Structure formats: C-alpha cells, structure tokens
C-alpha cells in the first residue's frame, strides 16, 4: 500500500502469536518492541535515540508478519515508548519513501 | 524521488542560509536539528523518544529547503544526536511510504 504521513504510520504486526501495533519508522536502524514476550536465547545490546540510550534484548532470526507480508530478522525487546519497525525489516518489505 | 531504505535516508537541506544533512523520519512527529542557529523568538518545549526527553527550542514558521523543494513550519532546535525531518515537514513535501 501507499501511505501518507498525515497520521502516524501505524501497522498491525503478528509476532510469536501476538498481535501488536508498531510505527513504520524510517528514522530507525532496528526493530524495537516493548509489550512483547519472545522465547529462547538472546545477546544484550545497547541502542540509542533522541533522548539517549537503552539496554535491550537482541533476538536474532525472528518472524514478523507486518500488514500480512512476512519478514525475518533481528527484533529488539526493551523499554521503548512505542513499538517501531526499523529499516532492517522495512527493506524486507520492499518499502520505499516517495516524494 | 523514490528512495530505498538500505541506507539511512539522509537529505541535504537548506535552512536559514545554513546547509545541513538530516534523516527523513516517519517515526518523528516534529523536525529537530542540532547544529543550527536560528534568529528571533522561540517557545520552550519538550519532546521525547528512545531514552526519554530532550528540552528544545520551538521556532515557528521556519522555511526549510530539502531536495530543492520548499516547506515552511515548526523546526525544533536541541540536543538531538542527528538531524531529523519529521512528519510536519514530510507531509508538505508530499512524501509517502510505499510498501
């Protein structure tokens, strides 16, 4: 779908049987989710944004279904105010900016 | 132009005679710059993101030029790690997400 930026670009994701909403975020390198519970091994990693730095759990090779189109990749789990779909997933959706 | 997202989406912008680079950020409501200096009055305002809050200066009705296309509106000035073109400006550049 094409989508304007007059309202926050929120999409519906399915990740590990859980339904969540997340922001399609061209201003993000990675994918970060808060209200979620993934199973298995992970490595700690530190990520930063406009207001500084948070420690998150780095899960590799995770399957997300975002708008019913699928991607696999790194998902991060930690205290992020809003769930974001970053560019590692967005490039998998063949997602572009157009102006 | 259409832009893919394998590289951080950086554009060159002209603001107040100053040339800068800035990320096109669909995950941002506002436009925030660090290394700029604007003239005139401003209101104090606080914004947040990954890591909490930064205190910024709100300048109103500021002309910005990105990819040589013009837009006018609120530009925020404060301690942001990288320059960011938010949705208040992107809607004006008729910028869309396609996926």
């Amino acid at each position: 779908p094409q989508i304007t930026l007059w309202q926050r670009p929120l999409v519906t994701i399915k990740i590990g049987g859980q339904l969540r909403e997340a922001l399609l975020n061209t201003g993000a390198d990675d994918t970060v989710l808060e209200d979620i519970n993934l199973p298995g091994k992970w490595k700690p990693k530190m990520i930063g944004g406009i207001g500084g730095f948070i420690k998150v759990r780095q899960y590799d090779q995770i399957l997300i279904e975002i708008c019913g189109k699928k991607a696999i990749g790194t998902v991060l789990v930690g205290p992020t105010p809003v769930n974001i779909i970053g560019r590692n997933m967005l490039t998998q959706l063949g997602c572009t900016l157009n102006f | 132009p259409q832009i893919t997202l394998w590289q951080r989406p950086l554009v060159t912008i002209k603001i107040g005679g100053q040339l800068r680079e800035a990320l096109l950020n669909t995950g941002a409501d506002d436009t925030v710059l660090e290394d700029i200096n604007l003239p005139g009055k401003w209101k104090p305002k606080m914004i947040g993101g990954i890591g909490g809050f930064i205190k910024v200066r709100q300048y109103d009705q500021i002309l910005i030029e990105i990819c040589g296309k013009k837009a006018i509106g609120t530009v925020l000035v404060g301690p942001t790690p990288v320059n960011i073109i938010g949705r208040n400006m992107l809607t004006q550049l008729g910028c869309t997400l396609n996926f």
């Binding site: 922001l23 390198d29 990520i47 974001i84 | 914004i47 942001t80 960011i84």
Partner: peptide, 8 residues
C-alpha cells in the same frame, strides 16, 4: 513523539 533510533 520523535523516535529516532540508531545503534551506537
């Protein structure tokens, strides 16, 4: 509501 995110 400005969610920049890089990893440094």
């Amino acid at each position: 509501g400005n969610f920049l995110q890089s990893r440094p």
